[PDB]
Amino acid sequence: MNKKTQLLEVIAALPEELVDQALNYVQMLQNPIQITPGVCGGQARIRNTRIPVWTLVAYRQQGAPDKELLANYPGLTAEDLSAAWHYYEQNPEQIDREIAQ
Amino acid sequence: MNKKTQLLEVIAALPEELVDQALNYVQMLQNPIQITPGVCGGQARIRNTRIPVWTLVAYRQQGAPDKELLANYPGLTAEDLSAAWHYYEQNPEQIDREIAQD
Fold first, then answer.
1. How far is CA A47 from the centre of its chain?
2. Angle, nearest 10°, between helix axes B3-12 and A19-29?
3. Neighbouring C-beta atoms of residue B34, cutoff 10 Å
4. Which pairing describes strands B33-34 and A45-46: parallel, antiparallel, or unpaired?
């Protein structure tokens, strides 16, 4: 089956008492950045990848344009990069440390 | 204000690549067999109860037929018992340790 359809069909039959937990989970999945202890050292990363935000920032700082970053990592979107850049803006000390270490 | 319609909105906005993950999560949510640290000391239990799988297996192993379990614990369904027996079949060592004194 088509995946979007498969999920609609499941969600349409879901017990009402599970709606809140399902919503909370999918809302979490909407964030392109993920932090997971014991994955990439617990560092913030692009969701379901082994690409830490700081490595993207480091490659940019060393002169990689966005076209090169996206071309290198083929599941990566513009929104992922934009989210990485926003994460850096909100967490500059942490990321600058990761780059230095 | 309607969390069900909000859930519909968020699933429709989900990238293709995350749909399976969400499917698996929801299957876990609906599974008659639940495992979480804060209920039954992290032992496998029947959804919406504090009845561990191990207690149902112990009763079955002493000869309690399904109909007795269902009469005794009117919250349980046949799907719940069937799922308990499948869980035991898949995790026999774990359950047996829970039955044992310790």
1. 3
2. 30
3. 18
4. unpaired
Buried b (16+ CB within 10 A) or exposed e, A42-78: ebbbbbeeebbbbbbbbebeeeeeeeebeeebeebee
The residue range of the domain holding B17 is 1-31
Resolution in A: 2.0
Regarding whether B43 and B1 lie in a shared domain, the answer is no
**What's the CA gap between B92 and A52, in Å, rounded?**
40
Q: Based on the domain organization, do B18 and B68 belong to the same domain?
A: no
DSSP 8-state assignment for residue A48: T
Q: What's B95's DSSP letter?
A: H
Helical H segments across A3-91, by residue range: 3-12, 19-29, 53-61, 66-72, 78-90
Q: Which chain A residues are within 8 Å of B4, Cβ to Cβ?
A: 16, 19
Query: Are the beta carbons of B10 and A19 separated by less than 8 Å?
Result: no
Nearest-CA distance from B99 to chain A in Å?
31
Task: Check residue A23 and report its DSSP letter.
Answer: H
Method by which the model was determined:
X-ray
Residues A26 and A40 in one domain: no
Q: Taking a C-beta distance cutoff of 8 angstroms, is the pair A79, A32 a contact?
A: yes
Verify that A41 and A59 share a domain, yes or no: yes
